[PDB]
């Protein structure tokens, strides 16, 4: 495959986390999210009916998909992966399946995924899509309800405060997860990377059904290990996992998110953050320096691991200034 | 006067800075404001036509005047002073003089000063108004154009980038400044404090005209020294000025902002910030500890100086969590 | 005066009650207003913050001022009196004094009083204005707070639930009542009747100040007895008061609403309702018959008392069908 | 089947009629509907272009699906059946097939059926859907055009005033009826009851096609007799038909709406009203007492017939107070 | 077929061009279109991001489909063909495939194709649909990129200014062209004519796939020659081509637009304009006289060729007055 | 005076006509205005209720006051005069007196006069205001009702179709004309020219009262002869009046609009059009050539008459391309 050869040498990409959570920025009614601002809904058990009010404040006048891609491109990033739908269940694309999306429900009334797709295509960057296939806090049957003995960046993995009765992920799988994966893999042109996450609930068969649907719609799309149950083309390491020399040299619970796993094609990627948050967090100014970014990329890359470095856009659709400065500074260090 | 006796023993108040600048939060197009996020328009010479686009993003769904006043009251603050219009010229009340205001120009479509007024009244707090009488970057004849040999938190004191010709503050004084001062001193009930600022341009007679108008409309309102030209009832010290013991014990350019000045009624106030910014700034996490706040208040108060401590509300109308925590922590130190 | 001679022979007019209360139609959250639907805010102590939400639902697409005036005219009514502002304090005209009005605060965005004014003028009917000069539930200093030993159609005469502190009607008088009376007596052409109500609080001097302002702006406007303190040109009898023969034949607490009072010019008017409510009430189907309406009019008129017969428009701006049928039926009985 | 055993013992459910007709409440332009306010468009031959204007007034700020379900549940009702689309053709859910719906065409911009579905699920009530499969006054090929020798609550059964040419129900069946039945049986979770109506036009094969589609999408859904042509799992008796003892004891035109029909599974239901209208009607205050409701339910139930008792929500989305009072009163009579 | 016999005798129809281009009316930023005003995007290389702004100005309050069809009918026209989507790629109907359409993207929020379909049906006119299957300037893979050695009414046939990379029409064919053709041939009732255009890029197989889909959805639809590659039921002559007597008497590059081609069914049609533009152009006042129109129609018709005479609606949705006058004048010349 | 010396040498200015009439562009419901498109409301007796609908279509996305002024400046024009309110009574500025204005009543929600004022000031052009002091079709007492024996570009000079009763200009003078002249002469900075029109009704005293108000607010404003009754500082010739050499060389009904009148300060101006309409008219493509414009200007100027050359902006706020081309071409002919 072309995509396989390409990914092996790609080295460096940009990830984007952006959603209603970005407006709250890590705080809600005087209380804090963890370092995980995108988890605020679970962390503070914000009822859906309250969280939905954020749609009315979502008018990011400074969002510019071309300017974002241009930054990525100047830094030598070869691909961009963006959140189409995170755990809160809010879609950042025009979903016919679900009107809880950025196009229908906000005054912004624009398809953010569509604009980033088009921007990547003109600039020659490959395009990837993040989709939370398991957790969906907007759905009574969203995943996570079997996993609450394991600590999270929130409270429970599922929405356990609005939805307190019998739960069966199979229904959400059928009525929302699969139809939305169909939309994003159909309507945004060629997809090079599919970035799934926290496979806390879905079965082997469900992972497989997703894998086969993605391949039917996007034959060259490379699927990460967090689809779960070993149904994947490349290994995602843990959040900000930068392995020691020895571990990076050598390289299993298929549903854990940490550590190495087998990779028949020799493909690996660490997704990381510039500060310590995925979603934009007001409080978090612990931005890595140009030098650290440069060194992390060099280290990952020389052991054949791609560096997928995340930007959490703010409520106005901006790359934080300190993120842009860190990225452009790392670029300036490259001889 | 009752107001005079009250102010002398008031000790502690809350100041609020809030405006379009709060949405930008210290950055614009990848460049930084100084420590002064509310000066961003001058610091980066943002054309009015661009800055005005912020009105369309101004929908602060979490703004709650009662909850802000309640925090003030729990911390033992006896008065609240809010920005009705800062240097950028944007009014935070329904101005019939000028449609560049929060009621007419934004989807929020509410009178912020009106809501704060009513909240202070129900809670028994005294109400005060900040108004930038000299600088107004939305007006070709706004003040500051004689002062650009003095360094600022921005570039120029005036809007020198949209407006580059002959200037005469007398026109803005007549057509905007005085009619707006009339509005705010007529429509929001009893006003106990009038907080003017940076008298870089206005004449003795202009300062006097303001003083007399405020008194005609608000006989019990105390006017601060920054009205300029010696036309005042109490002395504002410098920004965050905490005077040494022997200066605080003893106590002249009437148009400078720093140091003591004469006060025939023995009234003084230092306005300070919890971090280092007046307006909300994402980048500023340098929040003073409860202990520092407590000690500053004790020191000012034992020399008969009031502590007016500022909160810069964020884009959603909220008291930053770290500000609320610092204030409640200082309160908890009053054993 | 022309107006004096005209009113004596006018015999029959239409009153209109219409406001936010008309949407609720006599119930709120499963609880009933009295027979007085327009008093629902007081009856159920609806916080202003909740009651104001009705502005969002106020889009009465079937309101037609010409059609309403035409009905009046076909029934032989010679004048129309409309609520410009009822006790809830919501203005049904474009008030620059207060944005709590039908033009600024609702999607309808139209001046109802302006449209009715123009309609009366084209059809040749005289125009009159109701204004609640004393009670204003939207104002902390609204009237009624001295009268709560007298039972009402609500709970208290004042808003005693949002505003629980010290009150002084003088402030509302100055800042809202008088400025709004100036607006309505300045902006809507010639006013023939001024209908004030429930003078529970205002002083002799305040009644006089109103009287003199109305005459300065509208020299020929006839003022009713409910301005209070004997400041009036004609006597309003009680709500639906149809006096016995011998009382009607011969004809004192100036601030009560019931019974005869002296009338230097020999002018009298009974305001009444077709059913038992002033504001539209879903529940009230006790519509008087054509015969009753005809007989009430004949009785009042033969003793030189005018009959001002009220329609409460529904939430879509319509004359209820049973009201229209009753009025046209009474008309048909006049030969 | 579980559903069969459940329905036999269910005894008591809530029906909801709600649409644009609810705003008019039984009147339009000074003319009356019959006791059937939901038939107003036919009764008064309101052109589609005029009737559609009601969408602009549809902002029911008091609609609260949780509170409606809670009332049902407290009265011991075990299921709730709601109008997804009545004869006027207006959908009360987000239909991709037709933008003439409450989500796309009104300022309310919400999926009413979706909110009721979610509320039923959290409370543990079963959910049922009414759909007018035959009559559709918004469609040129809507049913009814062969039936106009039979008297209606309106004028004609079809829209005969906008559409006066050759008609063929087969086209509406294919392009609107079947696609919409697919939507409502796909997107709102498990449906326990399907409530079809007035089978004036559809063929045996069309009834069968509907029956089979419902079963394919909702294997356990019980379908009522008004799907027509004998394609049903339970018998709906006539509107408010409370059968005499010996008829109720013993128990054929498959397309009539009155009387008993065979029921293989022994299932029966009478749908009734609290007053005399299905849709909200201002004029109709003829509310049955608690005692009548209790006695009707006891009578129906002791002959193994379910009582499906209708609420017609008003223009603001509320259960009329007198309806709520009647239902809570009947509940109170059950020791 | 019925349609074949009907078309042969139909003689005269109306064409409608209407879109965003109609607002610009032949000019943009002080530069001219060619008198093909609908080509202005290509002629002046207007970036999509700029051209899209026109959606915000699209509120044609005088559009009236019934009045347009009435005009057609009074002139004896037996069918109407309207632009569902022209070269700029903007849909004039509610497309679920693409939100760049008149319903979703403009304040008008109405389905223009839908309203015209309904109007034709009530008046008894046959309905036809224009769709640009090949050129689409809103799509990176839109057609025309192989044809830029042939001169156009614009610059390039494709959008070569926003999209400068690798291009493959197959992708647009699959993702936009075919799904939209399915929409228009499914949702707007019976279609008698399908009017395709400028087959610069699509293959024989693509033409065939379209032809077969149209026939599957619309078995009686007649397809014109500009579908290309010989896949058609009738011949469209060139733009405003009025053939000389001996060519009209006798009657091959299947993908050219000029001249005769074979027609097994003996069906032909010339589409023409009243002035010289398809889309509305301010500059074009060169309106043909009644006499010319009459003579063109008589000439075409006596050789068995239908005359499809275009109206370009203005930005308010109106038939230009001079167009209406020309058409009514031609009608009056038929004694 | 400085203004007098400046105007005498000014030579050349730009006039702007822009309003609701510009959208109709000379046509309404299939009928024509004369070559006076701004007169369409009178010409076709458009009821106010219908004409007001145009506000909903008024969203001129291409309006750019800086670019208009820059064109003026590049042509050597020294001043710009704009319609603040034409005969239709619609204000193009934010009027507190009357909400029938471009700020309050349209989605554009911008102060056109304000933007032009600011643009003139930055570019160094003097600013002037046109105001229809006599005719006002939106006011029952608007002028013209004494003049209907004199032919107009419309039907009657007044609105005689909505308002058919007793009329008295004195009321409109007091309640709209004078208050609005105060607004425009107070809120837009220094005004160099006041351009009044068609003094068909107002008295000498009324003319004088206007003159004296303008001078009180704008001491250096030059007032034209069409204020009427000899109350003026300079003479406006007739519309498009280019006097013969001998009349221009040596130079009375004070209320006629044609021919010379005395000018004690020697000031004269001809206002003309580039085509033959003041307001934008679709049909009017009779644009004068560069040569004609140049020769007109030279002729007027060498006899000491200023040339005030009008642009009628289109519905999108543009200078028509042919007008821009004519003006730039005339400029190019100046050696
Ligand atoms: C239960 C009833 O069913 C049909 O007979 C309708 O025509 C009614 O008006 C109502 O929805
Ligand atoms: C009928 C005409 O056909 C093609 O040749 C288009 O490119 C035209 O500009 C228009 O639609
Ligand atoms: C200069 C012209 O003046 C008058 O004659 C008006 O009636 C015209 O409409 C235009 O404003």
Numbering used by the authors:
A (entry chain B), B (entry chain E), C (entry chain F), D (entry chain D), E (entry chain C), F (entry chain A): 22 to 272, 279 to 362
Original authors' sentences:
Microbial α-l-fucosidases catalyse the hydrolysis of terminal α-l-fucosidic linkages and can perform transglycosylation reactions. In contrast, fucosidases from the GH29 family have been widely studied since 1970s9 and are reported to act on a broad range of substrates with hydrolysis proceeding via a retaining mechanism.
It was only possible to grow diffracting crystals of BaGH2926A wild-type (WT) in the presence of 2’FL, resulting in a complex with Fuc bound in the active site while the nucleophile mutant BaGH2926AD128N was crystallised in an apo-form (Supplementary Data 1&2). BaGH2926A WT and mutant displayed a (α/β)8-fold, typical of GH29 enzymes. We propose Asp260 as the putative acid/base residue based on its superimposition with Asp242 of AlfC26A from Lactobacillus casei W56, although this catalytic residue was not experimentally validated. Compared to fucosidases E1_101251B from R. gnavus E1 and Blon_23361B from B. longum subsp. infantis, the BaGH2926A active site was shown to be constricted, which may contribute to the substrate specificity of this enzyme. Tyr57 may be implicated in BaGH2926A α1,6 linkage specificity. From closer inspection of the active site, it is expected that BaGH2926A Ile284 would clash with substrates presenting α1,3/4 linkages, whereas the presence of an acidic residue in this position in Blon_23361B would create a stabilising hydrogen bond to the substrate.
